[PDB]
Amino acid sequence: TVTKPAEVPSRIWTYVMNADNAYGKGGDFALLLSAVIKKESYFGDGLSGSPSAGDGLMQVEPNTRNAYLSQFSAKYGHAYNHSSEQDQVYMGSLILNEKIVRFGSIYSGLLHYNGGDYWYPGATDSYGRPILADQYANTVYAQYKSYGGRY
Numbered sequence: 535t536v537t538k539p540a541e542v543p544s545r546i547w548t549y550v551m552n553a554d555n556a557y558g559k560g561g562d563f564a565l566l567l568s569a570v571i572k573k574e575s576y577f578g579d580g581l582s583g584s585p586s587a588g589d590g591l592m593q594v595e596p597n598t599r600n601a602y603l604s605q606f607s608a609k610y611g612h613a614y615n616h617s618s619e620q621d622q623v624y625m626g627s628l629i630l631n632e633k634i635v636r637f638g639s640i641y642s643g644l645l646h647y648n649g650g651d652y653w654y655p656g657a658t659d660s661y662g663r664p665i666l667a668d669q670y671a672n673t674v675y676a677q678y679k680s681y682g683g684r685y
């Protein structure tokens with residue numbers, strides 16, 4: 535059985551569970567999306583001061599959001615609204631789920647979520663920061679496991 539980790543705030547859990555339902559994941563994707571958002575934005579409390587603050591809860595970069603708009607709209611029935619927190623989480627979900635499916639694993643989905651499909655040790659993000667996509671996937675997967683992930 536799955537349950538909200540006590541550290542995850544109510545409003546976030548609602549958002550990821552809605553994402554989880556849109557994928558039929560039995561509550562398990564919700565746990566992985568919780569781990570992702572904690573690392574990415576600290577639920578929103580870890581955004582301010584960073585140059586990528588404006589990219590929201592799952593930290594999807596502007597050019598990445600642009601690439602997935604029509605896909606977002608098909609999956610969820612409305613045009614992506616970056617001001618909607620629920621949409622931000624819906625957008626990160628769709629992309630993460632697309633990588634997990636495409637590459638065949640959670641770990642690999644996580645690595646290429648943070649680094650893109652062509653990440654190499656040393657590559658930089660849209661802000662020019664180093665992307666440590668291996669470390670990201672290790673510690674996000676550990677987190678997902680602690681929260682009860684089964685897969």
Ligand SMILES: CC(=O)N[C@@H]1[C@@H](O)[C@H](O[C@@H]2O[C@H](CO)[C@@H](O)[C@H](O)[C@H]2NC(C)=O)[C@@H](CO)O[C@H]1O
Nearest residue numbers: 572573574575576580581584586587593648670
């Ligand atoms: C030292 C440390 O742990 N800093 C954390 C940051 O890693 C985290 O930043 C987010 O990191 C992702 C890479 O791990 C980025 O893709 C994402 O853009 C970035 N978020 C921001 C707002 O810059 C922040 C956010 O919670 O928390 C620290 O724990």
Ligand SMILES: CC(=O)N[C@@H]1[C@@H](O)[C@H](O[C@@H]2O[C@H](CO)[C@@H](O)[C@H](O)[C@H]2NC(C)=O)[C@@H](CO)O[C@H]1O
Nearest residue numbers: 594595598601647648649650651652653659660
């Ligand atoms: C969650 C997130 O936004 N991850 C970012 C990656 O998408 C991103 O990758 C780059 O994204 C574009 C997606 O349309 C591609 O045009 C581009 O080719 C791709 N780069 C690579 C190396 O695959 C990276 C880098 O900007 O940042 C992540 O945060």
